[PDB]
Amino acid sequence: MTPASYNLAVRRAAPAVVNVYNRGLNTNSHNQLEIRTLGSGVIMDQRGYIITNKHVINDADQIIVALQDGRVFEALLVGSDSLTDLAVLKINATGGLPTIPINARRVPHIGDVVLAIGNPYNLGQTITQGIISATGRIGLNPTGRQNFLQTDASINHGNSGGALVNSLGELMGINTLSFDKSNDGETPEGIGFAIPFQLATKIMDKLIRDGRVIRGYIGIGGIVVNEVSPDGPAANAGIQVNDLIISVDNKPATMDQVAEIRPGSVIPVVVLQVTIQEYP
């Protein structure tokens, strides 16, 4: 009969995920381009915009992008974002480019079968399968309030920046890192994280437009406000010291709400006008 298979998803989405190489000029003493790190990327549209992880391309002198169809390009870094660890590259292609399937109306569900596309240890493109293990995850350890998709689809060094698609080849997220880090001794198995496609996309458009993700910084740290260490300047508009608050710009009491408001706009804060600055 017919073997159970996810080849349809592979056939549809794999052509669009690329191998990314970070090369440096001061990596060897003869200053000849050499790989410092490598990972994966996902071709988003035919203009040549590619998404990858910032950590994959940090401090590179040359970023190389190789497609499964054999073409190799030099990529330009249009922008990156520390908070989400996303970076957007751009290659100059003629002849057309394969692009990753995106279904903007699809909502990822815990339990959805998923496939991770990438270049682990540079063995060449590999597909691993699992399911969406959880959503809205902090992933890391601190705050990094950037919802992560969690999955048990095997992810290794080289998969970063690559694609996580469902059985229809639809983009679910950008794989970012494996919980390889067990603060002491153990080796977690099947705990990997990926940035949700919708967030990936919003970040990308902002990076293409501004060349950086402009966020709204009110001026405080630490529901309620309170910092164990000194507060910021922009908090000298029309607010107290260490208290809560409810309506900020006509709406009930938010974190990722402050950042979304353009800097310079006077906003009404309750418990009344404050000017937002670009997150320093």
């Binding site: 601190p142 910084y217 009110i218």
Partner: peptide, 4 residues
């Protein structure tokens, strides 16, 4: 811990 927040960052507003």
């Amino acid at each position: 811990v927040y960052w507003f």
